[PDB]
Amino acid sequence: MKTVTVKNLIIGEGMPKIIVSLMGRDINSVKAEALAYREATFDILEWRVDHFMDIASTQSVLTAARVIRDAMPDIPLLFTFRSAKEGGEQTITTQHYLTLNRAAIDSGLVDMIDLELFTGDADVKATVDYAHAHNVYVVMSNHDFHQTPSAEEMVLRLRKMQALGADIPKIAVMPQSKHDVLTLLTATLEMQQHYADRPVITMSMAKEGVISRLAGEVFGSAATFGAVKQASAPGQIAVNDLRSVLMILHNA
Numbered sequence: 001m002k003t004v005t006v007k008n009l010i011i012g013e014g015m016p017k018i019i020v021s022l023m024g025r026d027i028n029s030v031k032a033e034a035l036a037y038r039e040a041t042f043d044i045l046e047w048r049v050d051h052f053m054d055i056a057s058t059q060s061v062l063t064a065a066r067v068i069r070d071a072m073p074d075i076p077l078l079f080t081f082r083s084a085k086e087g088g089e090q091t092i093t094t095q096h097y098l099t100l101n102r103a104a105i106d107s108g109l110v111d112m113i114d115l116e117l118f119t120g121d122a123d124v125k126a127t128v129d130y131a132h133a134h135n136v137y138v139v140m141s142n143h144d145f146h147q148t149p150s151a152e153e154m155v156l157r158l159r160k161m162q163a164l165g166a167d168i169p170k171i172a173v174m175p176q177s178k179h180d181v182l183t184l185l186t187a188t189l190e191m192q193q194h195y196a197d198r199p200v201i202t203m204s205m206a207k208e209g210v211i212s213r214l215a216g217e218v219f220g221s222a223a224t225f226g227a228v229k230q231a232s233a234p235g236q237i238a239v240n241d242l243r244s245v246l247m248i249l250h251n252a
């Protein structure tokens with residue numbers, strides 16, 4: 001799709017959309033964070049479910065989703081379990097990971113889910129098709145918190161997500177140099193101009209990669225993450241400062 005419309009939001013045109021991550025270890029924490037987040041300005045709420053420390057209970061997770069909706073009933077909601085090996089707080093079985101995403105989809109509470117590409121092709125393609133049958137969008141994702149792959153590897157990774165039916169391919173990579181930031185910006189622009197028929201989200205993390213979080217309108221990332229009080233990955237800046245920069249670039 002040229003653009004992904006979610007609620008009142010067009011992803012893939014105009015200024016990149018601003019995502020913040022909500023991180024709560026229990027239901028009381030999730031409630032407090034949701035009430036604090038609704039006094040910040042952003043386009044999409046990501047719920048980082050891997051920070052929730054009663055992950056074994058599917059209904060506990062759904063109860064926490066309902067509290068987020070009690071506080072922010074309408075905001076586009078992205079449900080993300082991030083595995084430890086890709087930057088997250090814990091590891092679950094493949095079966096439970098698919099059960100949590102199926103429950104999220106079935107709840108009617110969530111607009112998008114995050115699926116990690118390296119979960120495995122048959123499992124990812126099934127959850128994509130399930131999401132789509134329930135009018136839920138899929139951000140398919142991959143993360144490297146240690147290094148930056150070649151531009152060719154990043155393009156082919158994003159293309160494989162597209163091939164598996166991802167609405168919005170996403171990749172986050174860690175620069176070890178400033179040249180690595182250019183590699184990520186080059187891959188991004190190759191997707192937007194040539195290899196993608198849908199929006200992509202991309203970022204080079206850490207301080208060196210901050211420009212990648214600001215320059216989406218230029219090089220073709222459709223969304224960008226900011227911090228309300230606490231970053232969910234290195235390089236996220238204050239969401240008001242992020243908004244300031246996006247508006248200056250949009251307006252020249």
Ligand SMILES: O=C(O)[C@@]1(O)C[C@@H](O)[C@H](O)[C@@H]2O[C@@H]21
Nearest residue numbers: 021080172203205225232233
């Ligand atoms: O902004 C980043 O660098 C992230 O690692 C944060 C994640 O919470 C989020 O799901 C996006 O994977 C990106």
